[PDB]
Design a protein around this ligand. Structure first.
Ligand SMILES: [Mg+2]
Ligand SMILES: [Mg+2]
Ligand SMILES: [Mg+2]
Ligand SMILES: [Mg+2]
Ligand SMILES: [Mg+2]
Ligand SMILES: [Mg+2]
Ligand SMILES: [Mg+2]
Ligand SMILES: [Mg+2]
Ligand SMILES: [Mg+2]
Ligand SMILES: [Mg+2]
Ligand SMILES: [Mg+2]
Ligand SMILES: [Mg+2]
Ligand SMILES: [Mg+2]
Ligand SMILES: [Mg+2]
Ligand SMILES: [Mg+2]
Ligand SMILES: [Mg+2]
Ligand SMILES: [Mg+2]
Ligand SMILES: [Mg+2]
Ligand SMILES: [Zn+2]
Ligand SMILES: [Zn+2]
Lengths: 87, 25, 97, 120, 129, 81, 217, 206, 96
RNA sequence: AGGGGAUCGAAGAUGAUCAGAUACCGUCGUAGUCUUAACCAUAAACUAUGCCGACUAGGGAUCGGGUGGUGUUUUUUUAAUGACCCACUCGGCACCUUACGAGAAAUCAAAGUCUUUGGGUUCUGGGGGGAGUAUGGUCGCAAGGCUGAAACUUAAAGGAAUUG
């Protein structure tokens, strides 16, 4: 949200649901941001180094949080099978 | 008074003004 | 406001049933709004069962109960029978015991 | 009726919480402990209190009591934990359903076998 | 009976978006629905859509992102007098710096901004933002 | 649910939907060649019928109609398509 | 002395989080009012309204006092707090606090044309509470705040220079009106416009980066 | 982006089938689940144990990704989880909650049960619903042991198992722990059936 | 979708309907029926000059106890008889 | 206007009750209640919720129809039937649970998809009384139905929920 001359104006460009791309606003105290850790050879789990996702309070209320995550992590590489895109 | 009795009240009242007016036709 | 979704009592897809006469006051009341008890009981009673068997021909006989459907009128249902009156919530419960 | 007020019962809790070592099954000494460790304004209330911190003490020795947890118990249990020497791969093979086995066949490999069926 | 086949295809979209979905199937499609669908896509408010061909009137599968708050239809196709395009965008768009009135002119189904640049006007279909 | 392939639905969950609610709609009736070896020729019957279909030359009955699929008669034989 | 009892509280006092925009970014639940006191000290209290309410009891009539308070700077941060105690100053102490907790951001904007510093709104927004709906509309500069004296002060403290308003319903009930105007400017930062379509990497949480420098003992 | 050896071993499958973790629910069957796998006739559905193990891994991945391993709470008011969870928390960072939850533990600093974690493991979202509801007032991701009839409202990543009873719960909890340790961890290498008995995590007697 | 017609040719029905319903306006009806000119002691004009018939002592409604000094007036352009209050302390002493 | 007229029973008459008791309760019982041929056109005629069309969320029952199964049961010699069990699917009467959403609330799968306000169409309401009254027209054998004002008066009347 720039201004007259290129300068950045208006604080705070909010997070978004990785699932719906809706804005995750402040009073949305039901939203969630999962940190999934990257792992290296021989199972070591590398502290402070995550593949991360964010889900809106909406999606979680609707119970879609598990399925939505399933897709997301898997077509990113953390799952193998589980989720199907057909029904 | 009960509405239905008041509806009956004016039914009577009406039938009377129906009479009086008829004396004059 | 509206006090019940069954309104008075239980009729959805009909518009007219047919009055039964109340067993206790003779009041007419729709059949589906009736409040109904199957009063079954032995023709004898409590203590008479021994005296009955004993002063009889036959080995223990058989014994027959009396089967009587009962149709109360709401006010009659409340004044005695099944009624209490229940809280806003407990009202919703259709379970018998 | 001799049901104790809250002030008493509450004081027993708080005491047993932070002075379980010291204290005893005995009232008389539990009595005297109170004078040292805590401030009370009447002889009566102190007795009142101690006779109940005594009572509470007396059946803690025979298993825990809700409300009171002086950490020593939660660790006493955590060591006390252990069991087993059997498990539940003996003997022979795993008995599966038709479809369980198909679940096996359609993902993995090695598995002992055993069929079933069942009805309505 | 269906009066505006457009109205259904718009509504259906909005509902999916609101329910947080990513795709709608709509029925039964028309030339008009497609072109309206096409404008929305030109500006990002949906992704890819696809015409499946029943030997009937058609179905459409739309794939939507999430940048869509509303896509509505204007029920009578009111005539608009190029001077009064202003008044419309005002009544029913969120701000003057984005969002579109999309309408039907003699020179194609176009969003009001294109309509202005080309200098044509006409009747008014719905809108997007 | 929330995200899925409307365009490539699975054959089973497609097979179980209503005949007008599949992706593109089509019938799930079928035709067969039917024969009772008294003769040497086969007649073609619709899986559903309404008319009690008689064979080529012989007054015979082949099937009686029902509320849907015709019941083929007594001892016969058939092959779809 | 402070002594926080919050992962978030400790981190703030510990000078590890400098601005609320951070908190709003990760949508952190605030519980300790002193958070928004060190985090935003330019605030000013406003007692919007005070009404007597009363209750009947098995031995008494509890007439206590309800007070509505709005706090904010005049620079994009509001908070509306409603509390009822039986002393008036008591109701005003607590209300200010509650209103500090409720402190939220405003997305302000230009009526149209870039120029220098957002003076209005980014979109129209509606807020409803009870029967009242308050509808906020972008307006050219020097339009002012077109609103009734209560809502105008709320928009002012919230830091909006020019906006239009329309209201609907029994607006005479101040409690619902401000709560709806409060919802309305709150809604501005959940409105997705094309300038916010750009994907962002998803920032990392203060609760994890200063994991150590938070935490109980 | 896949480990390589973290495939589902034959001994684990054996492990799981013996515990009946794959034995689903009956007529009941929440629509929100493709974790299913063919209806075993007369009631029971069979649970895709691969996707079980595979969720479990993700669970573990997420769990041992909390900087301080203790604000990883394991709830279970279900007795069948109480013994298990206490054990889980023992072996890993994890603070435990067995027995009664007590409401106002995530909201309300004033409470003495007060936690403020970064993640919740939980065993029956029906029985332990207070925790799931509470956390969603305050931004806490929720890993959860679910079944074929469990409410997936506000639980991300469901470990699809069998809270019908017995060992399954314990089995999973053990496996959970057993994996969170094999990660940046105080453990080992390849197969390694692990020292600790799986029957340690179990509901006791009578 | 409830109510009114929407269509592009339904202008007439839309005007008629309004016409029909405007009648429930208390002020509109008074205007169009010419109630003013017809009822109402004045013509419909702002003031009216009349002649004093008797001085009244109207007793006030509850919850007020008083005697409101008034006058019976016969409007000149009219013959219409009307009663009117005489405002302020005394003033009835001025009329006759 | 005929027939019928067992029953229960406006009216009437009576026994009691009561300060009174034109009633409630008890008795007698006219009309009526039933039927034919004509009238009448109103009911809290109610779900106090117009109709057609789309979309939006879960669950177990049930009525009708249909499809599927090396299902159960009927014995004869196995079938064929029939009733039953499981899955699915149209269309019904409803209930359960949630609520994204709606509401002033009670509540509501519509009373949702509405100030981010437009799918098509019908009808009615515009503070309370005055009053469904007056008047005219029209229908009716009548009782009455439909249509249906004003003068004047008045600051409330009303809804839902809360505490007493
Ligand atoms: Mg005469
Ligand atoms: Mg009421
Ligand atoms: Mg009542
Ligand atoms: Mg009826
Ligand atoms: Mg005021
Ligand atoms: Mg009128
Ligand atoms: Mg006079
Ligand atoms: Mg003249
Ligand atoms: Mg008779
Ligand atoms: Mg009499
Ligand atoms: Mg008498
Ligand atoms: Mg009499
Ligand atoms: Mg009527
Ligand atoms: Mg009704
Ligand atoms: Mg349903
Ligand atoms: Mg069959
Ligand atoms: Mg007054
Ligand atoms: Mg009450
Ligand atoms: Zn009765
Ligand atoms: Zn033949």
């Amino acid at each position: 949200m720039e201004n007259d001359k290129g300068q950045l104006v208006e604080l705070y460009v909010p997070r978004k649901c990785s699932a719906t791309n809706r804005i995750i606003k402040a009073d949305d105290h039901a939203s969630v941001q999962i940190n999934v850790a990257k792992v290296d050879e021989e199972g070591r789990a590398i502290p402070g180094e995550y593949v991360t996702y964010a889900l809106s309070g909406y999606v979680r209320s609707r119970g879609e949080s598990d399925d939505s995550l399933n897709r997301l992590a898997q077509n990113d590489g953390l799952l193998k099978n589980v989720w199907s895109y057909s029904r | 008074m009960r509405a239905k009795w008041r509806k009956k009240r004016t039914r009577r009242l009406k039938r009377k003004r129906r009479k009086v007016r008829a004396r004059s036709k | 406001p509206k006090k019940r979704a069954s309104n008075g009592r239980n009729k959805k897809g009909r518009g007219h049933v047919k009055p039964v006469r109340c067993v206790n006051c003779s009041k007419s009341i729709p059949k589906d709004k009736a409040i109904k008890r199957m009063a079954i009981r032995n023709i004898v009673e409590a203590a008479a069962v021994r005296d009955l068997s004993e002063a009889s021909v036959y080995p223990e006989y058989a014994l027959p109960k009396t089967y009587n459907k009962l149709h109360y009128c709401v006010s009659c249902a409340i004044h005695a029978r099944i009624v209490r009156v229940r809280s806003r919530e407990d009202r919703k419960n259709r379970a018998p015991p | 009726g001799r049901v104790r007020t809250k002030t008493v019962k509450r004081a027993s809790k708080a005491l047993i919480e932070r002075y379980y070592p010291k204290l005893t099954l005995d009232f008389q000494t539990n009595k005297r402990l109170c004078d040292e460790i805590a401030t009370i304004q009447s002889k009566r209330l102190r007795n009142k209190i101690a006779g109940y911190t005594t009572h509470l003490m007396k059946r803690i020795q025979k298993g825990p009591v809700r409300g009171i947890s002086f950490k020593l118990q939660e660790e006493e249990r955590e060591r006390k934990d252990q069991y087993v020497p059997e498990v539940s791969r003996s003997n022979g093979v795993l008995n599966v359903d038709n479809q369980t086995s198909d679940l096996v066949k359609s993902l993995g490999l090695k598995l002992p076998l055993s069929v079933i069926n069942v009805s309505a | 009976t269906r009066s505006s086949v457009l109205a259904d295809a718009l509504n259906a979209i909005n509902n999916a978006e609101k329910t947080g979905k990513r795709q709608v199937l709509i029925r039964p499609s028309s030339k008009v629905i497609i072109k309206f669908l096409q404008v929305m896509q030109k500006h990002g408010y949906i992704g890819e859509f696809e015409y499946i061909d029943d030997h009937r009137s058609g179905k459409i599968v739309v794939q939507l992102n999430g940048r869509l708050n509303k896509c509505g239809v204007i029920s009578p196709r009111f005539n608009v007098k190029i001077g009064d395009i202003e008044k419309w965008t005002a009544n029913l768009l969120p701000a003057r710096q984005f969002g579109y009135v999309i309408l039907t002119t003699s020179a194609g189904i176009m969003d009001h901004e294109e309509a202005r640049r080309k200098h044509v006007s006409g009747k008014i279909l719905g809108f997007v933002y | 649910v929330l995200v899925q392939d409307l365009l490539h639905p699975t054959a089973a969950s497609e097979a179980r939907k209503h005949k007008l609610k599949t992706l593109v709609q089509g019938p799930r009736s079928y035709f067969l060649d039917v024969k009772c070896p008294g003769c040497l020729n086969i007649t073609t019957v619709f899986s559903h019928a309404q008319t009690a279909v008689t064979c080529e030359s012989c007054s015979t009955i082949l099937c009686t109609p029902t509320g849907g699929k015709a019941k083929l008669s007594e001892g016969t034989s058939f092959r779809r398509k | 002395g402070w002594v926080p009892v919050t992962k978030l509280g400790r981190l703030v006092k510990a000078g590890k989080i400098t601005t609320i925009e951070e908190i709003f970014l990760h949508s952190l639940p605030v519980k300790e009012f002193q958070i928004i006191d060190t985090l935003l000290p330019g605030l000013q209290d406003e007692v919007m309204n005070i009404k007597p309410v009363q209750k009947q009891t098995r031995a008494g009539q509890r007439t206590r006092f309800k007070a509505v308070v709005v706090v904010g700077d005049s620079n994009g941060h509001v908070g509306l707090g409603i509390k009822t105690a039986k002393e008036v100053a008591g109701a005003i102490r607590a209300g200010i606090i509650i209103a500090k907790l409720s402190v939220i951001p405003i997305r302000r904007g230009y009526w149209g044309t870039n120029l220098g510093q957002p003076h209005s709104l980014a979109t129209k927004t509606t807020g409803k509470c009870g029967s009242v709906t308050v509808r906020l509309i972008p307006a050219p500069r020097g339009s002012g705040i077109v609103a009734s004296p209560a809502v105008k002060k709320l928009l002012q403290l919230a830091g909006v220079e020019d906006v239009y308003t329309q209201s609907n319903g029994k607006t005479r009930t101040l409690e619902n009106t401000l709560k709806a105007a409060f919802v309305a400017i709150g809604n501005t930062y959940g409105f997705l416009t094309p300038n916010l379509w750009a994907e962002q990497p998803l920032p990392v949480s203060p609760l994890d980066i200063y994991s150590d420098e938070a935490s109980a003992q | 982006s896949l480990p390589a050896t973290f495939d589902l071993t034959p001994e684990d499958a054996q492990l799981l089938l013996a515990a009946n973790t794959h034995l689903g629910a009956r007529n009941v069957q929440v629509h929100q689940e493709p974790y299913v796998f063919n209806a075993r006739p007369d009631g029971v559905h069979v649970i895709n144990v691969g996707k079980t193990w595979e969720k479990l891994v993700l669970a573990a991945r997420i769990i041992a990704a909390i900087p301080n391993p203790e604000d990883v709470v394991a709830i279970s008011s279900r007795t069948f989880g109480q013994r298990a969870v206490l054990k889980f928390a023992a072996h890993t960072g994890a603070t435990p909650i067995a027995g009664r939850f007590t409401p106002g533990s995530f909201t309300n600093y004033i409470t003495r049960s007060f936690k403020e974690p970064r993640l919740v493991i939980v065993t029956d979202p029906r029985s332990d619903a207070q925790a799931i509801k509470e956390a969603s007032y305050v931004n806490i991701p929720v890993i959860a042991l679910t079944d074929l009839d469990s409410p997936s409202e506000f639980v991300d990543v469901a470990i699809p198992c069998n809270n019908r009873g017995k060992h399954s719960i314990g089995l999973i909890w053990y496996l959970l722990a057993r994996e969170v340790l094999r990660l940046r961890g105080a453990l080992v290498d390849r197969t390694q059936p692990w020292s600790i008995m799986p029957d340690l995590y179990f509901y006791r007697d009578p | 979708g409830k109510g009114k017609p929407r269509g592009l040719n339904s202008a007439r029905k839309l005007r008629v309907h309004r016409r029909n319903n405007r009648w429930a306006e208390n002020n509109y009806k008074k205007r169009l029926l010419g109630t003013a000119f017809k009822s109402s002691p004045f013509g419909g004009s702002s003031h009216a000059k009349g002649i004093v018939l008797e001085k009244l002592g109207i007793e006030s409604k509850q919850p007020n106890s008083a005697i409101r000094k008034c006058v019976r007036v016969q409007l000149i352009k009219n013959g219409k008889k009307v009663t009117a209050f005489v405002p302020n302390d005394g003033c009835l002493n001025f009329v006759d």
